[model samples]
Target: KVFGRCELAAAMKRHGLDNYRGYSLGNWVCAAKFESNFNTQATNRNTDGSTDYGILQINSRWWCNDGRTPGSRNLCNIPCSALLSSDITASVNCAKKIVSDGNGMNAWVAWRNRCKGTDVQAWIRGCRL
Candidate 1:
């Protein structure tokens, strides 16, 4: 299970992600909702034979080892299973690194599809601080 949208927003704020690396909190929230519905254990397979893992759906081919995956770059230097934990410290850390390495929220498909150029204020509508 994952946090409710408002809960997740608070958690992100606690993690100091309100404007991390110049990305708004709303963008991250929208992407997380669409990516995994905030589920920590979410996993998805891509047509490229790569698997996306956890809340952020980070790719197993590049970010972590799924054990079944060989030759993974392990770019985040973590096991894919680690991302499936209820505690998302590692997930947030890796996502931040990914964002740093890529094009802001453009790294996430959900952000481009559902959140891009939209008024994401609703994502934090009732969240306090």
Candidate 2:
């Protein structure tokens, strides 16, 4: 699903991800922008021959199946395709699991490279929700 930043923030809040795993709503909003631009259908090919799936860009190497790769832990116990839908519950749930494991936002390279220490508030500017 395509979403503007405000819309995305509202959804994230509803999922209790506004402050999940000690990460702020700003953190989640910033990471999602860099990772997928709030597009649930987003997928990207990684240099390691793995693929990233969904709004959070969960990796096929450990999170879900991309069909081309095997031995995926499928830790989310979900098909990667499930993440491509407009509904973001599965993606958020999976991300929560990853965060609960003490990974926090570190699981996302986008967060590390782009969101970290930046003005995360900019990502949620004008959301007002």
Candidate 3:
């Protein structure tokens, strides 16, 4: 599958998702849907009225090449916000990193409880996860 809860969970586990229970596997799934429609191969231009880039809407203008320095830019190419520059695997990984780095994944947890393995549209409508 291009992307799914299990796949996200696996990626997170490999990247230390389960290490923290506050952020459930479901959270990753819903986040992916909300952010990229679970399509690791997704991307968009200034679509959301922001410089957001890549699958998880990673703002390349800010978090580009600074991936290692801890306070630089994203340094990602991904023209037209396509995955060509970062790729699906990298996108998912970055998304997980962002979620964890943001609010201790609290937002991700809340999003997960908001959208489980259900349809993306349905989940967005506040359905049971």
Candidate 4:
């Protein structure tokens, strides 16, 4: 479930992601680009044996329980496999909860490196998001 740039922008916007937790929609857009390259099926394994899932790359460590990551807290109370859906709803909701739990976009190094304190405005400029 690979999505185009604007396509991803519109999808996230539809999920009420605009200015979510004080982070701009473009910030989410840029973050998503690096997170999973707009692919909903994306998954990343970590050394802790936890896995990142779906477009927004929800982690199995603290959010969803994959039933594999030992001692998972599952703060979102959702199955990690649910994050793989192409609907964007699960990941969007999970992402919102994550940003809230982790204290803004600072939770992700990719955002700090690419989206935060940088030029994400242009990323969604053409999309009118």
Candidate 5:
């Protein structure tokens, strides 16, 4: 996976601390509960082992950094990749933007209905990342 739970959580915490003035904890925990439940070692394998990787579910093949490598190293440099990069700050900010976007909750809804279920993605409703 990208940076594992510790790394990702640390990044989320940093973002919340910086952006929300102490509200980041609740936001972070809530999003985790909704998306992956803080499973740092978590990974969703495709029929191919190298499809999606890491806690934030980043796709290495699709994410290209300045080094042009498959993935980013940490949250500090996450902007090098996709909206949700391997970096924690990047992931958290990405989540924030997603939630701010009207499609955030709706995407979760569609994903639940098509992929898993509402129970798995319930936090998506008020999830502002």
Candidate 6:
């Protein structure tokens, strides 16, 4: 499912992403914008034979097991494929684990480039959540 800006914001907020690790709701919103454009089914194959999946684009390397990332530790302990589902809960939980494990939001290179030093609150302008 593709989402509008506020729709994505609301969803992320519902799942406890707002300031999950000193990152704002707008931070999650911006990450989705840069990472996967808020598309639940989005995926990007990596050069390492891994993939990034869903809105957060959680990586197959170390986080989720794709069965193809060669020796993935599966730290999130979830099937990478589940990240693509419209349910979104697993993806959010895994992302939380990524931050909880101290990788922080920089786990996404896109976040570093696009969301790290910007006016992130602007991304959530008018978002009711």
lDDT of candidate 1 at residue 23, scale 0 to 100: 80
lDDT, residue 127, candidate 5 = 32
TM-score of each: 0.94, 0.93, 0.51, 0.95, 0.37, 0.94
Better of 5 and 6 by TM-score: 6
Against the reference, the lDDT scores of all candidates come to 0.87, 0.87, 0.50, 0.88, 0.42, 0.88
Listing every candidate in turn, what is its Cα RMSD in Å to the true structure after a full C-alpha superposition? 1.1, 1.2, 7.4, 1.1, 8.3, 1.1
Q: State in Å the error of residue 52, model 3.
A: 3.2
Order the numbered candidates by TM-score, best leading. 4, 6, 1, 2, 3, 5
TM-score for candidate 4, residues paired by index? 0.95
Candidate 5 structure quality by residue, lDDT tens digits, 25-77: 43444445445555443444345333333334443333323343434443333
The model with the greater lDDT, 3 or 5, is: 3
Better of 1 and 5 by TM-score: 1
lDDT of 1 by residue, 1-129 (tens): 687998888888887788999888998899999999999999998887779988888988888877877677888999889999988888888898888885877889988999998998889998886
Q: Model 3 — which ten-residue stretch has the worst lDDT?
A: 120-129
Task: Please give the lDDT score at residue 28 for candidate 1.
Answer: 84
Number of backbone clashes in candidate 2: 0
lDDT per residue, candidate 2, 32-58, as tens digits?
888998899999998888899889899
3 against 4, candidate with superior lDDT: 4
lDDT of 2: 0.87
Clashing pairs in 4: none
Candidate 4's C-alpha lDDT? 0.88
Give per-residue lDDT, candidate 2, residue 122: 79
What is the alpha-carbon RMSD of candidate 5 to the true structure? 8.3
Which lDDT tens digits does candidate 3 get at residues 76-118? 3323334434335566555555655656544344355556444
